[PDB]
């Protein structure tokens with residue numbers, strides 16, 4: 001029976017929870033009677049992405065209502081939804097098409113988790129917790145709560161909660177140190193860059209099996225390029241709550257997972273307003289969306305030579321900008337090394 005510490009065992013159960021996967025699908029309005037968890041396929045999901053691509057194009061370019069209807073119908077025949085009372089919303093506005101894109105990204109991660117859970121359980125010798133642990137191909141350790149390491153992380157959470165994100169405050173339940181197999185090796189060249197920072201990335205718990213096993217990923221050339229304020233890459237925050245928002249917790253379901261990654265940012269192409277980034281300027285390594293509030297440059301510390309912008313959020317001076325808070329975007333998966341996973345309690 002499992003040799004893993006209690007918190008890690010619990011983490012593995014959380015990541016692989018079948019009930020959580022179905023709840024996700026239900027919130028996305030999928031009909032679980034006609035499309036059960038069991039039936040999700042990678043091939044089908046990918047096809048959905050093309051239909052969404054095509055219908056986004058038609059909406060943007062002023063295609064005919066019948067082209068839009070035909071594509072709506074095809075989307076809903078491939079992925080059965082249950083709208084209960086209501087009429088099926090048509091895929092005729094960009095806001096709603098982007099929500100569908102989001103849904104497909106979540107289904108792919110759910111498909112990944114479910115398939116791992118169901119595959120490769122041959123070994124009756126090993127505890128199934130340990131079998132499942134091993135499928136994440138990630139070394140995980142509990143960070144002792146009284147160590148200076150934990151103390152720095154806790155302050156980053158305490159000080160960098162945003163003003164406008166006041167629905168809840170946050171408590172760190174547990175901190176894990178994580179190392180994804182092959183990731184150190186893959187990140188290694190980027191140690192030569194300057195301006196390596198420890199930044200937040202939030203996602204739903206049901207994505208974590210795919211994230212640990214596959215790393216953070218960049219959207220395929222095949223999804224609509226439509227709602228990405230700064231193009232398709234990996235997005236991070238220096239304010240805990242801006243990331244924590246993307247955990248999709250509730251009063252009903254208050255436990256989330258959030259990452260701290262070392263992001264090798266180098267020379268930041270700084271920006272104020274949405275811009276569909278295709279290639280980066282010469283000698284630029286990353287994009288920063290500038291915000292009206294950010295941690296205080298004064299308090300910024302270092303953890304293992306990585307900058308930790310753990311200062312209380314102060315005004316930025318810049319105001320001629322769309323964004324309320326910073327975000328940071330990289331365009332090569334190799335520029336991210338995940339360092340910690342935190343279990344968070346959202347008190348609403």
Ligand SMILES: C[C@H]1c2cccc(C(N)=O)c2C(=O)N1C1CCN(C2CCCCC2)CC1
Pocket residue numbers: 098101102200201202203226227228229235236237242243244246327328
């Ligand atoms: C805003 C940005 C961001 C900034 C900082 C941190 C995080 C973080 N996840 O922690 C995130 C984050 O996840 N962002 C997403 C970017 C992609 N979109 C959509 C995807 C579907 C297609 C249209 C766009 C959703 C929000």
